[PDB]
Design a protein around this motif. Structure first.
Motif, PDB file in Angstrom:
ATOM      1  N   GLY A   1      -1.256  -0.890   7.523  1.00  0.00           N
ATOM      2  CA  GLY A   1      -1.443  -1.965   8.568  1.00  0.00           C
ATOM      3  C   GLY A   1      -1.260  -1.653   9.858  1.00  0.00           C
ATOM      4  O   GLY A   1      -0.570  -0.731  10.408  1.00  0.00           O
ATOM      5  N   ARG A   2      -2.255  -2.250  10.714  1.00  0.00           N
ATOM      6  CA  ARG A   2      -2.192  -2.176  12.332  1.00  0.00           C
ATOM      7  C   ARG A   2      -0.834  -2.670  12.735  1.00  0.00           C
ATOM      8  O   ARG A   2      -0.538  -3.878  12.410  1.00  0.00           O
ATOM      9  N   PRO A   3      -0.253  -1.925  13.865  1.00  0.00           N
ATOM     10  CA  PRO A   3       1.004  -2.674  14.336  1.00  0.00           C
ATOM     11  C   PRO A   3       0.580  -3.788  15.178  1.00  0.00           C
ATOM     12  O   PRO A   3      -0.404  -3.808  15.586  1.00  0.00           O
ATOM     13  N   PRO A   4       1.599  -4.717  15.281  1.00  0.00           N
ATOM     14  CA  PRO A   4       2.953  -4.461  15.038  1.00  0.00           C
ATOM     15  C   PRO A   4       3.236  -4.976  13.663  1.00  0.00           C
ATOM     16  O   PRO A   4       2.713  -5.936  13.327  1.00  0.00           O
ATOM     17  N   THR A   5       4.219  -4.289  12.764  1.00  0.00           N
ATOM     18  CA  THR A   5       4.213  -4.683  11.366  1.00  0.00           C
ATOM     19  C   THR A   5       5.796  -4.369  10.995  1.00  0.00           C
ATOM     20  O   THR A   5       6.036  -3.263  11.072  1.00  0.00           O
TER      21      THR A   5
ATOM     22  N   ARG B   1      -7.188  -7.110   0.481  1.00  0.00           N
ATOM     23  CA  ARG B   1      -6.605  -6.038  -0.487  1.00  0.00           C
ATOM     24  C   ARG B   1      -6.528  -4.682   0.280  1.00  0.00           C
ATOM     25  O   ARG B   1      -7.265  -3.840   0.623  1.00  0.00           O
ATOM     26  N   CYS B   2      -5.274  -4.564   0.812  1.00  0.00           N
ATOM     27  CA  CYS B   2      -4.988  -3.349   1.829  1.00  0.00           C
ATOM     28  C   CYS B   2      -4.850  -2.040   0.592  1.00  0.00           C
ATOM     29  O   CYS B   2      -4.363  -2.055  -0.164  1.00  0.00           O
TER      30      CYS B   2
ATOM     31  N   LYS C   1      -4.337 -10.804  12.960  1.00  0.00           N
ATOM     32  CA  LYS C   1      -3.675 -10.540  14.306  1.00  0.00           C
ATOM     33  C   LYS C   1      -2.599  -9.385  14.232  1.00  0.00           C
ATOM     34  O   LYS C   1      -2.402  -8.653  15.278  1.00  0.00           O
ATOM     35  N   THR C   2      -1.807  -9.291  13.151  1.00  0.00           N
ATOM     36  CA  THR C   2      -0.912  -8.304  13.025  1.00  0.00           C
ATOM     37  C   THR C   2      -1.162  -7.523  11.798  1.00  0.00           C
ATOM     38  O   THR C   2      -1.353  -8.523  10.513  1.00  0.00           O
ATOM     39  N   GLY C   3      -0.977  -6.389  11.311  1.00  0.00           N
ATOM     40  CA  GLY C   3      -0.796  -5.882  10.020  1.00  0.00           C
ATOM     41  C   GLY C   3      -2.035  -5.588   9.591  1.00  0.00           C
ATOM     42  O   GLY C   3      -2.069  -5.300   8.212  1.00  0.00           O
ATOM     43  N   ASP C   4      -3.189  -5.710  10.563  1.00  0.00           N
ATOM     44  CA  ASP C   4      -4.810  -5.704   9.650  1.00  0.00           C
ATOM     45  C   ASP C   4      -4.822  -4.078   9.145  1.00  0.00           C
ATOM     46  O   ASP C   4      -4.381  -3.217   9.698  1.00  0.00           O
ATOM     47  N   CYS C   5      -5.158  -4.120   7.995  1.00  0.00           N
ATOM     48  CA  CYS C   5      -5.366  -3.133   7.144  1.00  0.00           C
ATOM     49  C   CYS C   5      -6.759  -2.769   7.023  1.00  0.00           C
ATOM     50  O   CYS C   5      -7.520  -2.898   5.935  1.00  0.00           O
TER      51      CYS C   5
ATOM     52  N   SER D   1       0.814  -1.180   0.119  1.00  0.00           N
ATOM     53  CA  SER D   1       0.135   0.125   0.083  1.00  0.00           C
ATOM     54  C   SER D   1       0.845   1.298   0.188  1.00  0.00           C
ATOM     55  O   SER D   1       1.891   1.097   0.552  1.00  0.00           O
ATOM     56  N   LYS D   2       0.246   2.274  -0.468  1.00  0.00           N
ATOM     57  CA  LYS D   2       0.980   3.548  -0.188  1.00  0.00           C
ATOM     58  C   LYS D   2       0.197   4.403   0.700  1.00  0.00           C
ATOM     59  O   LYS D   2       0.709   5.628   0.628  1.00  0.00           O
ATOM     60  N   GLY D   3      -0.544   3.895   1.480  1.00  0.00           N
ATOM     61  CA  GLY D   3      -1.283   4.853   2.553  1.00  0.00           C
ATOM     62  C   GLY D   3      -2.509   5.158   2.119  1.00  0.00           C
ATOM     63  O   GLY D   3      -3.415   5.160   3.128  1.00  0.00           O
TER      64      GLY D   3
END
Length: 207
Positions: free
Chosen positions: A81-85, A76-77, A67-71, A18-20
Motif C-alpha cells: 500500500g501507499r504510505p503512510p502505513t 483486494r490488494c 487516503k492511506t495504504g491504497d494498493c 499482501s506479500k508484494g
C-alpha cells in the motif's frame, strides 16, 4: 497460518494483506468497528504485510481509492500500500521459525498490535498517537504520518547506500513506538516465534 485481523478502531478500516506480488488470502476487506477478519496465509510466506487503509471508497468491481495504504485502487490488494502505513510484517516458517515485526518505515496511519494467538513468543505493538504528534513536515493531508524517506527522498532517510544513521524523524517514531522499526538500519525489533504460529493483528488495540 491463521491471522485474525481485528478492527478495534471506532472507524471503518479496509484491511489489506499482501506479500508484494500477490494478495494474501482475499487480500483486502472492509472491517467496520469491531469486525474480525480471519485469513489463512500459506506456510513459508516470506515478506508478508498486513496494514489498514483509511477513508476508502470502492465501487462494485472493488476499485476505488483510500487516503492511506491504497494498493493501486483495489479493495483486494495484490501490491503493497501507499504510505503512510503502519505495517505488520512477517515471514513464516523460515528455518523452523516465524518472524514478526511492526514497522514504521513506511510511516504510520493506524495504531496496531501484532500478537501470536498461539504460544512461544510475545507480541509487538505500536499504539501511540503518532498521527496527533506527527512532525509538521511528515503530516499526510489524507491522514497519517509519513516516514522521512517517503517525504524527502534522500539517501540518508531511505538508507539507499546501506549506510545511514537515525534521524530526527526516525527518532520521533522510535520515541513513540520503541518496539517498531523506525528506519532501515534500526536495531531489529523483530520477534522470533515458533514456526507455524497463529496471529492476531488488532487495529487500535487500546482504549
Amino acid at each position: 497460518a491463521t491471522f485474525e485481523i481485528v478492527n478495534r478502531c471506532s472507524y471503518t478500516v479496509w484491511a489489506a494483506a499482501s506479500k508484494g506480488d500477490a494478495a494474501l488470502d482475499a487480500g483486502g476487506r472492509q472491517l467496520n468497528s469491531g469486525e474480525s477478519w480471519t485469513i489463512n496465509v500459506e506456510p513459508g510466506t516470506n515478506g508478508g504485510k498486513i496494514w489498514a487503509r483509511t477513508d476508502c471508497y470502492f465501487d462494485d468491481s472493488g476499485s476505488g481509492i483510500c487516503k492511506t495504504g491504497d494498493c493501486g485502487g483495489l479493495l483486494r490488494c495484490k501490491r503493497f500500500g501507499r504510505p503512510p502505513t503502519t505495517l505488520a510484517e512477517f515471514s513464516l516458517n523460515q528455518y523452523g521459525k516465524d518472524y514478526i515485526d511492526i514497522s514504521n518505515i513506511k510511516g504510520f496511519n493506524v495504531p496496531m498490535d501484532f500478537s501470536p494467538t498461539t504460544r512461544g513468543c510475545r507480541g509487538v505493538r505500536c499504539a501511540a498517537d503518532i498521527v496527533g504528534q506527527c512532525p509538521a513536515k511528515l503530516k499526510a493531508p489524507g491522514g497519517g504520518c509519513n516516514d522521512a524517506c517517503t517525504v524527502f527522498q534522500t539517501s540518508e532517510y531511505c538508507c539507499t547506500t546501506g549506510k545511514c544513521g537515525p534521524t530526527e524523524y526516525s527518532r520521533f517514531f522510535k520515541r513513540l513506538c520503541p518496539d517498531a522499526f523506525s528506519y532501515v538500519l534500526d536495531k531489529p525489533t523483530t520477534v522470533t516465534c515458533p514456526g507455524s504460529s497463529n496471529y492476531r493483528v488488532t487495529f487500535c488495540p487500546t482504549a
